[PDB]
Structure formats: structure tokens, C-alpha cells
Amino acid sequence: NKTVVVTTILESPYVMMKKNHEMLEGNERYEGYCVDLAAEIAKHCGFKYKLTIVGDGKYGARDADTKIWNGMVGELVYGKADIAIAPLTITLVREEVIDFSKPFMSLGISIMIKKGTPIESAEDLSKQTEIAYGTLDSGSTKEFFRRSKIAVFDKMWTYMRSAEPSVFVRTTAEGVARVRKSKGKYAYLLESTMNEYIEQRKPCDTMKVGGNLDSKGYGIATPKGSSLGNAVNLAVLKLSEQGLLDKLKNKWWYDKGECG
Amino acid sequence: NKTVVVTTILESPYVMMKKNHEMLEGNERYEGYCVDLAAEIAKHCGFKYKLTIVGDGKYGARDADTKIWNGMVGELVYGKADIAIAPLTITLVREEVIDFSKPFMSLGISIMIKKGTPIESAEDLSKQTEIAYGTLDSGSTKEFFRRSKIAVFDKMWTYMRSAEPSVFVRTTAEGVARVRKSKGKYAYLLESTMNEYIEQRKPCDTMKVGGNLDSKGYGIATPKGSSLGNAVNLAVLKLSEQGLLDKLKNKWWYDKGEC
Numbered sequence: 214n215k216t217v218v219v220t221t222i223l224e225s226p227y228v229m230m231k232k233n234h235e236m237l238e239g240n241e242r243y244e245g246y247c248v249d250l251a252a253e254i255a256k257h258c259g260f261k262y263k264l265t266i267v268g269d270g271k272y273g274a275r276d277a278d279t280k281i282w283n284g285m286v287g288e289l290v291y292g293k294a295d296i297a298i299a300p301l302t303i304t305l306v307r308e309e310v311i312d313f314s315k316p317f318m319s320l321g322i323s324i325m326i327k328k329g330t331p332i333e334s335a336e337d338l339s340k341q342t343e344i345a346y347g348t349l350d351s352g353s354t355k356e357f358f359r360r361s362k363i364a365v366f367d368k369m370w371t372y373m374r375s376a377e378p379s380v381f382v383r384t385t386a387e388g389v390a391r392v393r394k395s396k397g398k399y400a401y402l403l404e405s406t407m408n409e410y411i412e413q414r415k416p417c418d419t420m421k422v423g424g425n426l427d428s429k430g431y432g433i434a435t436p437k438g439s440s441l442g443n444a445v446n447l448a449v450l451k452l453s454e455q456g457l458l459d460k461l462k463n464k465w466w467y468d469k470g471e472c473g
Numbered sequence: 474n475k476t477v478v479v480t481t482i483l484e485s486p487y488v489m490m491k492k493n494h495e496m497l498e499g500n501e502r503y504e505g506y507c508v509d510l511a512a513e514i515a516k517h518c519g520f521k522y523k524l525t526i527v528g529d530g531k532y533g534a535r536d537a538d539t540k541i542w543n544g545m546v547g548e549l550v551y552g553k554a555d556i557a558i559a560p561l562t563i564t565l566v567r568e569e570v571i572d573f574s575k576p577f578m579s580l581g582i583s584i585m586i587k588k589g590t591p592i593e594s595a596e597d598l599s600k601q602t603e604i605a606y607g608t609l610d611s612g613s614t615k616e617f618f619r620r621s622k623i624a625v626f627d628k629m630w631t632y633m634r635s636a637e638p639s640v641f642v643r644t645t646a647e648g649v650a651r652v653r654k655s656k657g658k659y660a661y662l663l664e665s666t667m668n669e670y671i672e673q674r675k676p677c678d679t680m681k682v683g684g685n686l687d688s689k690g691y692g693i694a695t696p697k698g699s700s701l702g703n704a705v706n707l708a709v710l711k712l713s714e715q716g717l718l719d720k721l722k723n724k725w726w727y728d729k730g731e732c
């Protein structure tokens with residue numbers, strides 16, 4: 214019996230510091246969808262756990278030169294954490310080095326605009342220069358554009374990779390702030406889950422436009438061959454079938470909506 | 474090196490007989506989304522394969538008395554097939570006896586009505602008596618209602634399990650025909666994928682109403698511990714990331730929609 218080290222990331226509404234966090238200790242400092250999910254997974258799998266925030270604040274990508282993984286993925290690969298419970302996208306390159314449970318949430322890449330921005334689609338962004346657009350660094354959305362052979366997305370990447378000043382951001386919060394402050398001149402490409410959450414938070418000045426660009430899932434990740442992988446997978450399916458995942462999504466997205 | 478036996482099911486538009494199937498042979502007799510997907514999975518994983526239609530025409534459930542698995546799940550469990558490539562729902566009870574890849578398609582349980590039926594939600598169905606409703610008699614949708622602790626769905630199951638004559642059907646096609654012939658007095662609970670497909674088929678007299686009741690996925694299934702599982706999983710993720718799954722959905726659902 215060992216305390217499971219959980220790596221996660223501060224990303225609303227998945228993991229957030231409670232208002233009164235400075236007077237709280239350990240796991241009690243945090244709240245959110247992944248905090249609730251971690252508690253459920255641990256209960257069903259019968260383990261005790263410690264939530265830790267990923268040191269470098271990243272999801273995980275592999276450096277092309279050194280081949281070293283960063284982010285939550287790196288924490289699993291190098292044995293610094295036992296499990297990642299976060300909005301971590303299931304991708305081919307990651308599945309090669311870590312294990313993922315069946316998905317607990319669906320999502321797709323989507324477009325965030327400041328309200329009133331005359332953009333309705335990815336096609337619309339790709340055909341103009343007035344409105345800058347970019348993505349998060351070290352995540353699956355950037356890799357999507359880097360790899361896409363779809364004409365519109367390829368054009369978009371050609372623009373984004375060489376754009377000056379840089380259109381990429383270190384955190385989702387930075388991307389959102391950039392939209393809010395840029396008077397309609399920056400659009401942000403981010404996962405529909407995060408986009409839909411921010412759309413329902415004050416100051417209610419952003420919106421999701423167009424359909425999703427792809428369709429994928431977040432999964433709970435463990436190091437390759439971990440003893441926990443099997444149980445975690447079954448727990449995710451149990452929570453899905455009990456309706457708990459739906460309950461948590463309602464709790465953290467729409468029950469907490471502040472744009473009416 | 475051995476030919477992989479693929480179990481699948483005749484379910485439109487996943488697997489269908491080609492119009493000229495009697496003058497074709499082997500895998501060439503069939504067409505559809507899962508036929509296209511099987512060819513791709515096989516190419517990427519480097520195996521030869523034979524498509525076979527599940528003998529009993531069922532998805533897979535375990536008999537409460539005999540504890541024997543039927544349908545495509547049974548074919549995997551008892552060693553008759555090496556892989557199932559079909560609209561087979563990932564469920565906990567199945568994942569305990571077979572392996573699933575990461576999902577290749579997302580779906581949820583949904584409501585099919587004859588156009589004009591005064592029903593907009595599961596809540597609506599549960600409150601009234603005039604319009605009967607049911608599910609495929611063997612499958613994950615029936616098990617969803619059987620197991621649900623959610624009040625609306627519990628109410629629906631309490632009605633369905635006791636309705637006479639039976640509100641359950643043997644095939645999706647039977648459920649669809651029942652909606653079409655019942656003048657608005659039967660609604661059919663089925664997966665959103667199959668609902669959305671039929672919505673685009675002549676005579677264009679059905680529609681999907683309300684939100685989905687759950688959210689889940691179909692996966693490619695292999696017998697527990699099979700050597701093929703890892704490669705199949707990586708192939709699904711590659712095909713997802715390359716846009717192929719989206720292309721195949723558009724091909725079989727919308728590009729040739731008749732409405």
C-alpha cells in the first residue's frame with residue numbers, strides 16, 4: 214500500500230485552487246472536475262493519493278532534438294508520477310510511450326473569438342491576415358496543425374509557425390486573455406471543452422464559433438505497463454455507465470455558468 | 474502468418490450486402506463503413522482477413538442463467554473469431570471479457586420518432602402512455618435501461634420490461650419499420666449513429682429528437698490478451714488523427730443521404 218502520486222495541471226474547470234486555498238492543506242487545496250474525478254477513481258480502485266501540479270505547467274510534448282518528454286507525459290515517462298488525471302488528450306505519439314484509459318470526455322479543437330469578430334470558421338481564418346490566430350504550446354492542438362494535410366489547416370499552420378509576433382501561448386489562460394484584450398484581432402484555437410466553459414464565465418465576451426475541427430477524447434494516463442492501468446480503465450467505464458461523468462460535467466460547466 | 478477471422482454484423486450503413494453480391498466472392502460481397510474500416514485496419518496492422526457475419530445476428534449479451542455469451546462478443550469469447558469490426562459498444566461488462574481499442578466513433582442513446590409525434594425528450598416518453606417505446610432486445614441500449622438508477626430512465630425501464638405486447642425488437646431494421654408503420658404510436662430508442670443514418674434515408678419520415686441519453690463509443694474488439702490488440706489500437710488512433718474516420722462517416726451517412 215503506497216500513496217499514488219497524481220500529476221495534474223491548473224486548468225479551469227478541471228483543477229483550480231479553492232478561494233481559501235492558503236488555509237488548506239494537501240488535496241483539500243484544489244477543486245474541479247478532475248479533483249472530483251480523482252476522488253472517484255481512487256475510491257473505486259482502492260488507493261490513497263496525493264495531487265501534485267505538474268512542475269513545468271505543460272501537457273506534454275517530445276523535444277525533436279533530445280527526444281525528451283516534458284509536461285505530465287514526461288512526469289509519467291520518467292517515473293515522477295504514478296498517474297495523470299487531467300484534460301490530457303489521447304494521441305498516437307503519447308499512446309506509444311504511456312497508457313491511456315478509455316476516454317472520460319469527448320472534445321474537438323474549436324475556435325474562440327471575442328464577440329463580434331467577423332469569423333465563422335477555420336476556412337474564414339485561413340483566408341485573411343487582419344485577425345491573428347494561434348494555439349497552446351506543448352499540447353495536442355499545436356501538433357494537430359503541425360501534422361494536418363487538410364488544405365485549410367495546412368494553410369493555417371504555414372501562417373502560425375512563421376507569424377511575427379508569436380501567435381502561440383504558454384497557458385490556456387494566456388490565450389483567453391489575449392482574445393479578450395485584442396479588440397477582435399486575435400482568435401484562439403483550443404479544445405471545445407475549455408472553450409465552452411469560458412463562454413459561460415464573466416465577462417461573457419467570448420464565444421465558440423463554427424464546428425469542431427476534429428473529434429477525440431481525454432483519458433487517464435499511467436506509465437507503460439503500470440499495475441494501476443487495468444483498474445483505472447474499468448473505473449472510468451463504471452463512472453461513465455453510472456452517469457457520474459455526466460453529473461460532473463453539469464456541475465462544473467453549466468451549474469457554474471454566470472452568463473445566464 | 475494466418476488469415477484473421479473478422480466477426481461483424483449486417484447493420485446499415487456499417488455492413489451491407491452489395492447489390493451484386495451473388496456474383497462476387499469473399500470480402501468483396503460486402504460494403505459499408507465497417508467494410509472500409511476493416512480494410513484499413515488490416516492494411517495498417519499488416520494482416521490478411523476474412524469478413525464473416527455473426528451467426529445469431531446479435532451484438533453480445535451474457536445469458537443470466539447459462540452465463541453463455543451470444544453475438545459477436547460470444548464469437549470472440551469462444552474463439553470463433555479473431556476480431557470484431559462493427560458498431561459494437563464499449564461497455565464495462567464486455568471489457569471484463571474482451572478487449573476494446575480506443576473508440577472509433579462516438580454515440581449516445583437517442584429517440585427516433587415518426588415525424589409529427591408529440592415527443593421531444595425521454596422525460597416526455599416517461600410521463601405518458603399513448604405512445605409505446607422500446608429498444609433492440611439484445612444489446613447495450615437494453616442493458617442501459619435495465620441498469621439505470623436515474624429516475625426518468627428507471628421509469629422507462631419499468632414500463633418497457635412489462636409492456637405487452639413486447640416493445641423490444643430483434644433488429645434495428647425491425648425497430649425502424651415499427652416506427653414507420655405505427656402512425657406515431659411507437660418511438661424507438663437506438664444509438665444516435667443509427668438514428669442519424671435512418672434520418673437521411675427515404676422515405677424521410679423519421680427523425681431524431683431531443684439530446685442523447687448517454688455518451689459512449691464503439692471500439693474494435695479482440696479476445697482478451699490477443700496479440701492484435703496493440704496494433705489495432707495504434708491503427709485506430711492513426712486513422713482518427715489522419716481524418717479518415719471523419720471521411721468515412723461523411724461517406725456513408727451524408728454524402729449519399731436521400732433526404
Ligand SMILES: CN(C)C(=O)c1ccc(-n2nc(C(F)(F)F)c3c2CCCC3)cc1
Pocket residue numbers: 303304316317318319320428429430431453458575576577578579580688689690710713718
Ligand atoms: C465518456 N465519453 C464522452 C466517451 O466515452 C467517449 C467516446 C469516444 C471518444 N472519442 N475518443 C477518441 C480517441 F480515443 F481518439 F481519443 C476518439 C473518440 C470519437 C472519434 C474518434 C476518436 C471520447 C469519449
Ligand SMILES: N[C@@H](CCC(=O)O)C(=O)O
Pocket residue numbers: 272273300301302303349351352353354355402403404
Ligand atoms: N488537452 C491538450 C492541451 C490543450 C490543447 O492543446 O489545446 C493536451 O493534452 O495536449
Ligand SMILES: N[C@@H](CCC(=O)O)C(=O)O
Pocket residue numbers: 532533560561562563609611612613614615662663664
Ligand atoms: N451497439 C449496440 C447495439 C445497438 C443497441 O443496443 O442500440 C451494442 O453493441 O450492443
Ligand SMILES: [Zn+2]
Pocket residue numbers: 253256257457
Ligand atoms: Zn463512485
Ligand SMILES: [Zn+2]
Pocket residue numbers: 276277278279
Ligand atoms: Zn530542444
